[PDB]
């Protein structure tokens, strides 16, 4: 009933790719409902390191609809905020401006 | 219960042979970290996570389903045989649900 959803879908198994590459399609595209199931499936692989490295693209972007979802795939804060990935978070240049510098 | 969003008792009659990455939870009172993800299709099949209590009894048959049934009857049998200490209902009733 969405040629939306449909469209992505056939993208996304169309990439054929691993999640943690699709994550950086989908996050980027907003659309919260296809990485929800089409990336996260029942069983989709999610190797370490690039999960904890799309939750440090997810924070930079502002898409905070899809941190509360890697909190539900169990990004624990404890775990993922090294003292390094802070300092990525302090020093970065995507999103929205401020008046840091 | 994801709908009660508060606060819980729920006991679970299955068999351990049934249950998904059996090996990943052997270890004794011992904390072993079942990451909540199963195989898309698979023969042994994950316990829904936030459902607490469990009985999994491994009769030496993995995989195979049907090994609770019995034990569910014995389990509600002696319960409704405890007298419940309220003692006006007399035994804690069961409702079949």
């Known amino acids: 009933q969405d040629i939306d959803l449909a469209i992505l879908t056939a993208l996304l198994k169309?990439?054929?790719?691993?999640?943690?590459?699709?994550?950086?399609?989908?996050?980027?595209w907003?659309?919260?409902?296809?990485?929800?199931?089409?990336?996260f499936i029942y069983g989709q692989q999610w190797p370490v390191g690039s999960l904890e490295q799309a939750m440090l693209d997810a924070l930079v972007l502002d898409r905070v609809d899809f941190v509360k979802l890697l909190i539900?795939?169990?990004?624990?804060?404890?775990?993922?905020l090294t003292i390094s990935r802070l300092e990525?978070?302090?020093?970065?240049?995507?999103?929205?401006?401020n008046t840091l510098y | 219960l994801k709908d009660h969003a508060s606060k819980i008792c729920t006991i679970g009659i299955a068999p351990w042979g049934i249950?998904?990455?059996?090996?990943?939870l052997i270890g004794?009172?011992?904390?072993?970290?079942?990451?909540?993800?199963?195989?898309?299709?698979?023969?042994?099949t994950v316990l829904n996570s936030m459902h607490s209590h469990f009985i999994l009894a491994d009769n030496g048959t993995t995989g195979k389903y049907g090994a609770e049934?019995?034990?569910?009857?014995q389990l509600e049998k002696?319960?409704?045989?405890?007298?419940?200490?309220?003692?006006?209902?007399q035994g804690v009733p069961v409702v079949a649900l």
């Not at chain 1, 590459?21 to 989908?26: W, Y």
């Not at chain 2, 249950?19 to 990943?24: I, L, M, R, Y």
């Not at chain 2, 049934?69 to 009857?73: D, E, G, Q, S």
């Open chain 2, 69 to 73: 049934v019995k034990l569910r009857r």
């Open chain 1, 72 to 80: 539900e795939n169990g990004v624990s804060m404890h775990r993922f």
């Open chain 1, 30 to 39: 907003n659309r919260v409902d296809i990485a929800r199931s089409q990336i």
């Open chain 1, 14 to 28: 169309g990439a054929n790719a691993s999640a943690p590459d699709q994550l950086s399609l989908a996050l980027a």
């Open chain 2, 19 to 24: 249950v998904e990455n059996q090996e990943d």
């Open chain 2, 28 to 44: 004794r009172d011992v904390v072993r970290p079942y990451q909540t993800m199963s195989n898309p299709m698979s023969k042994l």
């Open chain 2, 78 to 89: 002696h319960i409704s045989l405890q007298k419940i200490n309220t003692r006006i209902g």
């Open chain 1, 88 to 97: 990525e978070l302090y020093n970065t240049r995507h999103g929205p401006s």
